[model samples]
Target: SFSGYLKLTDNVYIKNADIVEEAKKVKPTVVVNAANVYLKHGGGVAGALNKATNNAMQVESDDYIATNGPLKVGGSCVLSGHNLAKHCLHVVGPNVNKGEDIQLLKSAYENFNQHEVLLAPLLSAGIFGADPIHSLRVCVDTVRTNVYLAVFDKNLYDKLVSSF
Candidate 1:
């Protein structure tokens, strides 16, 4: 999977923290270090990272979640985090509108499915209430192309799938 190249000593570190520490001193072109494992939340736009909400380390949303101090439309925000599976994807929709959210989520699901990437649509707080079933609906309605829907609760999953 070497689609690109970089300096060995400066750009890449082979699972050696001692070398990585030394490499940092030189400020190499690129430095590879041990994989950093981090926990994240996933849900919807509202569940993403929000500094104003003081809810970090919460991966209740996709990796593409963003916050402009607070979640707002048409504003600059920091990306929540990188996707662990394959590609980081986010679908922006009008907060005030309803159908747009469905369309945006549908498109996102379709795009990921085409790539054979399993998509996990976090329940958006704006669309689904704090409850789990509501959130499941948000994921289902938008994901017509996908066959799988993963969630934390088995009961909730059964309820959601049965309803469909």
Candidate 2:
């Protein structure tokens, strides 16, 4: 469930919850996977999703890479939900340590607009060492449709709610 909720605009929101759990609902939803360029699901959001879907994502992702090559930073790959969601949009954001770009982070968020009920994590902020404020702001600004941000970390929740 969501502890903190904010309606940033008519179509955008922030929720204190987990995207993995949210993705499990039977409603038409697409969860954005905060993935690596290589599409490996070993850690962070990718790892949780890989486990949640019983490794179906890993198999699909491996096949995707074999055919499409590696995902680029700020780019994405879409996969069928495997029953966890309606679909899964895997996106790669820039790691702060490796020549971070705001536009790249923005592009990652922008890609989620393709879905109706889009659920996203705090992209690039977990293992990628991205600035939380920048990530939040970019998401707030670029969300063009029904986007729900699932921030499980209390600190992230606080930062999001404290603003509005």
Candidate 3:
């Protein structure tokens, strides 16, 4: 994904892996926003509800983690380790409510955009069970005028475009 972005002349990459390692091999800046740092695959929501506070607290810590805090059903702590970049902004979506998750995602993007960060990772729409199309719709709808989404996965790109 990094290579492709460089090949096309894009400037940023929202990586999920070790940013420091990737940084050693690339020239572009890297920012890490870690999520579910010490928790299991589905542990974030629980931590959010419990109000479990952890490291590197942000402006909207609760919303950023998506659960409420520790002990919440689906809450997560935003903790990613990335190499030094110009800046890094972290935001979280709202808890799972029927039909409202998309709006939460939109709100997250808006919050991040307000800070002028170049890129952010889109959570909530991955294999974690939230509908990817619905999540994408919220981003596309809200981010159209505010930001651009640079997707690396060819299939995901196709899926997003085809959905609309």
Candidate 4:
């Protein structure tokens, strides 16, 4: 059975486009929204999805790591939505400058099936704060399924594309 079969491929794609446009192409079963420091999708690619899905990210996300102050590193808050992918796994990265975040973005990818197609923005890279050059590597090695990354800016996206 296709559903019962196990898959073990890490096919990753790095494309130059907005996350939303990328979403239109893949129409993922899951979307890994590079979450923010405060458990909200307010800035960076997270924000783009926030708007593309009409606040579905905000209305559905729940971070367990921080009870007080904004989250530096957080867990995957899987959201259910109609406008967005069937599921959205939200994970926070570092911001402001040095990204010493322990959540590391890799953890958000743990529970999905191998056959699942997932979409994401480069976690902890760029406006969210951190070296995307390194984080992109982290995602390629870490995520558990077919992954797609939308690169809106060559300032960093170019690096990810070149890596392939």
Query: What is the Å distance of residue 140 in model 4 from its true position?
Result: 2.2
The collision pairs in model 2 are none
Candidates 1 and 4, the one with greater TM-score: 4
Q: What TM-score would each prediction reach against the true structure?
A: 0.34, 0.90, 0.46, 0.72
Model 3 earns a TM-score of 0.46
In the range 1-164, model 2's lDDT, one tens digit per residue, is 33345777787778777777777753345778889888899988889989998998999999999998998898898887776777888989888877777579988888877776677888888888887777888877887878778787978788777864
lDDT (Cα) of model 3: 0.39
Clashes of 4: 0
lDDT tens digits, residue span 52-89, model 3:
22332333444443664442222323333223333333
Comparing 1 and 4 by lDDT, which wins?
A: 4
**Pairing residues by index, what is the TM-score of model 1?**
0.34
> Which order, best to worst by TM-score?
2, 4, 3, 1
lDDT of each: 0.31, 0.80, 0.39, 0.61
Report the poorest 10 consecutive residues by lDDT, candidate 3: 6-15
Tell me the tens digit of each residue's lDDT in model 4 across 94-136: 5536536535556544433343666667776767666677767
Name the better of 2 and 3 by lDDT. Answer: 2
Question: Where is model 1 more than 4 Å wrong at Cα?
Answer: 1-83, 93-104, 122-147
